[model samples]
Target: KVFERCELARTLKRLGMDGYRGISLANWMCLAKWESGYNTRATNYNAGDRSTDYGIFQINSRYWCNDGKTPGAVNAAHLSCSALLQDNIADAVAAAKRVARDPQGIRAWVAWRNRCQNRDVRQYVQGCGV
Candidate 1:
């Protein structure tokens, strides 16, 4: 489910909060842009870690959800990584919020560290009527 910009913006606005996820809409929208381009079916395999990033948020199996095929997987999200790739991103949002609540805060998103910091990301949410 590749969302229209507005749909993605709305979802981010409603759920992407400073206190909830310690991530502002600007930062998260930027993250979503770099991570999956807001596509629900997004997948990225990392040969280095033998792990995969899944869903709109690009939740990594290294420390998050289980890959189902990987036995003895320690699932921090306690959910299937495949579930994060679903259309309705409620589960993805919830799990990511949990990650945000961790000690790293929004720093968990490497994309944000690389691209969202020290910049004016208001453009990410611009013209979305958010």
Candidate 2:
């Protein structure tokens, strides 16, 4: 599912991403805008590290979700990476919450740091009614 901007904002808010770990909903929207363009089935395989980023938040296989490869990896979310690809997004939202719990917060996603940090991200949620 490739979501419209407001749809995603409302969805994320409903999933408790707003102000989660002190990261604003717009920041999460900004991250999603860059990471997956609100596409539920998006994926990127990092050939260099042999790890894949899965789903909307691009939860990584190396340290977050388990993909059943990449050698000695941990399943921090206790979920299969496949779960993140679902259109429901509940599992993806849960995994994102786990990632935010880390000391890095939302900075766990490098894309967020590059595209969203210290920027005018409010437009991501503007008029979303979130």
The prediction achieving the highest TM-score against the true structure is 2
Per-residue lDDT over 67-127 for candidate 2, one digit per residue giving the tens place of the 0 to 100 score: 8887668988899998998889999999999999999998788898899998999899989
| lDDT of candidates 1 onward, in order | 0.81, 0.91
Write one digit per residue (lDDT tens) for candidate 1, span 52-112.
8899889988678988654445788888897898999988988888788799877888888
Q: Output the lDDT of residue 87, model 1.
A: 95
Can you list the residue pairs that collide in candidate 2?
none
Local lDDT at 124 for model 1: 87
Error of 1 at 81 (Å): 0.8
- As a TM-score, model 1 comes out at 0.89
lDDT of 2: 0.91
